């Protein structure tokens, strides 16, 4: 009656995982100015997107079980580690330090946040040593018994952040090999799960900027016409909440103090970039946020937030729950200097549900950092001569819900974001990877000639 017939190249696919390869824009693929994420090895990208819209198709997405974020995480660590090998390691720096407070032109805030340390260092010859001095932030030294030492010396050595490599978060595109395709969910109301009414296939994704931060998403992509709240299980207090802003709120950060970079010869061809002296007044670093806009933004977050927890509930915000500095503070880096800002002023309000104020956030700075929350790995960021300031782009929050039962009409949300994947998960939620299956068999009235 009916007779098997085989078709090749039919449009069928299934969920899968593969080793996506990078693709970079012409600007980052030809300047060749030693970007840390190594886009020189990354292949130049396509001249323009080849987006193809798939009509009548419905596909299911899941941004919390997406393997794209897991692969991106591993790639970032390897790129960061692979960029520290060729430049100097600061193993001789683990020596006793004689430190004293700096009080030349100190402002009231920075009473004791800087230490003037002097130590004996090895000169070009292996049998003679010379006394040298450097300025160290208070958080990067600890007492031995004055006498001081670096925090890391009892944990591991530190590799100096090489001076020619740059940490600018330039975009990167993750593109799939042949036989695979990337599906983009173009629905505006799709949060993180469920069928996507409108789906399109792309050669590969848009430029994802690997911006590293905590409690806040900076220089990210914005939502469309609404604030989006996404969580693996909203009813579960242990799961983080990802907020996305439709309209960005600008935050300005700076390091007012003016300092000069100084080079110390620790060996043949090896130099340690110390902090020589501070020029002019010494003032604490800080960041500014427009109070009117931030208050307006919080009025939009609560509007969407109250839907999940009940329109009659009281919404309250509070600062972090305490603990390590890396978690309790909004970490980032302006230029090449790492910041750790106190966000206790942003998250302080209560909602009852019926132009230059510039909320300022004091920020502390460190030079010995455990970037990826690892143990036994270290990097030293040398000082940047001159003042530094930058304007940023807030586009989301990483909130965690303090557990209060219905025996309370109150929902206590505090900043969170310990795991670093959620930072990139905010942008890779649209994309999924599938495997093409061009083999198919269907029935029809067809014989062979014989």
């Amino acid at each position, epitope marked *: 009656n009916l007779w098997v017939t085989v078709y090749y190249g039919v449009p069928v696919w299934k969920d899968a995982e593969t080793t996506l390869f990078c693709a970079s824009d012409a600007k980052a693929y030809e300047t060749e100015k030693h970007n840390v994420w190594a886009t020189h090895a990354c292949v130049p990208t396509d001249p323009n997107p080849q987006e193809i819209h798939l009509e009548n198709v419905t596909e299911e997405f899941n941004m919390w079980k997406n393997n794209m974020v897991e692969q991106m995480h591993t790639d970032i660590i390897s790129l960061w580690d692979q960029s520290l090998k060729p430049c100097v390691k600061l193993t001789p720096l683990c020596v006793t330090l004689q430190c004293t407070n700096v009080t030349n032109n100190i402002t009231d805030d920075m009473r004791g946040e800087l230490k003037n340390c002097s130590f*004996n260092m090895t000169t070009e010859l292996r*049998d*003679k*040593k*010379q*006394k*040298v*001095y450097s300025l160290f932030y208070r958080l990067d030294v600890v007492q031995i018994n004055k006498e001081y030492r670096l925090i890391n010396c009892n944990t591991s050595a530190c590799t100096q952040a090489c001076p020619k490599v740059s940490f600018e978060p330039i975009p990167i595109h993750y593109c799939a090999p042949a036989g695979f395709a990337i599906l983009k969910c173009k629905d505006k109301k799709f949060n993180g799960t469920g069928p996507c009414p409108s789906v399109s296939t792309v050669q590969c994704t848009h430029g994802i900027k690997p911006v590293v931060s905590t409690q806040l998403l900076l220089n990210g992509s914005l939502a469309e016409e609404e604030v989006m709240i996404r969580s693996e299980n909203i009813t579960n207090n242990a799961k983080n909440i990802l907020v996305q802003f439709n309209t960005p709120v600008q935050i300005n950060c700076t390091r007012p103090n003016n300092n000069t970079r100084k080079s110390i010869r620790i060996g043949p061809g090896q130099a340690f970039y110390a902090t020589g002296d501070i020029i002019g007044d010494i003032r604490q670093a800080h960041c500014n946020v427009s109070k009117a806009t931030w208050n307006e933004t919080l009025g939009k977050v609560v509007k969407q937030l109250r839907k999940h927890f009940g329109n009659n509930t009281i919404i309250r915000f509070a600062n972090s729950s305490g603990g390590d500095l890396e978690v309790t503070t909004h970490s980032f880096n302006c230029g090449g200097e790492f910041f750790y800002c106190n966000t206790s002023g942003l998250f302080n309000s209560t909602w009852i549900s019926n132009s230059n104020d510039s909320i300022t956030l004091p920020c502390r700075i460190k030079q010995i950092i455990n970037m990826w929350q690892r143990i036994g790995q270290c990097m030293y960021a040398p000082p940047i001569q001159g003042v530094i300031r930058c304007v940023s782009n807030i586009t989301g929050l990483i909130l965690t819900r303090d557990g209060g039962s219905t025996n309370s009409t109150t929902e206590t949300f505090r900043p969170g974001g310990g795991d670093m994947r959620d930072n990139w998960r905010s942008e890779l939620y649209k994309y999924k990877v599938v495997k093409i299956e061009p083999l198919g068999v269907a029935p029809t009235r067809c014989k062979r000639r014989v």
Partner: antibody
Amino acid sequence: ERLVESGGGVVQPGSSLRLSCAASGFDFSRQGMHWVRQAPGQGLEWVAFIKYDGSEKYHADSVWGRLSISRDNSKDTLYLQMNSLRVEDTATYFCVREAGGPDYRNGYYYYDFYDGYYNYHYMDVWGKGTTVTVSS
Amino acid sequence: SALTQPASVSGSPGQSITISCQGTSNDVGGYESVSWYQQHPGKAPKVVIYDVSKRPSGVSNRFSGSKSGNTASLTISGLQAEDEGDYYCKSLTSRSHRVFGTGTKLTVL
């Protein structure tokens, strides 16, 4: 190894004068210097000491506020400002070197800031000296 | 306040003599950095005992020095004609200053 002094003369009480010293044969920029004045029949009296770079100075109590010590490594010279001289100030001033060197420890040689010398606390080379007298 | 020294010391050739220098706990009893100097008329003094019990190069082995609490002394053995002259004692102070002694006159009979 020879310190040459100059500036001798006769001045009235309350006058001002400068004593100049020159050094050669050794690295003047690494070692501290002394000023010592001696009078006929009187024991040696110390005036002042200056670090190899001038960052630290010390003046004897007997002459505090009247005499100061200064140096200029760029010129390999040592200076002493005589201000408001009096009858008791007449004496022969000697331009002296502070013997010193690296501090041997743990098999290494330790030199001060900018490869400066540590003090061994004795005087080795002395200049011929200069004389100044006060009279009415 | 210079260190106290005997006004004069005498001794015939072939004898052994000692010159005493006394200070305070702040200067003499605080450090071993005590020096002795020999001087002749018309020339600046020369250091003979730069540390408490050591001598520089070029000086005779007859010299000897010692310290005892708040006092120090210089010993010369086998007195000879050329040993006649003046001697001074120096010591470091607690406040990084240097103090000389009153001086001693050595006479060879």
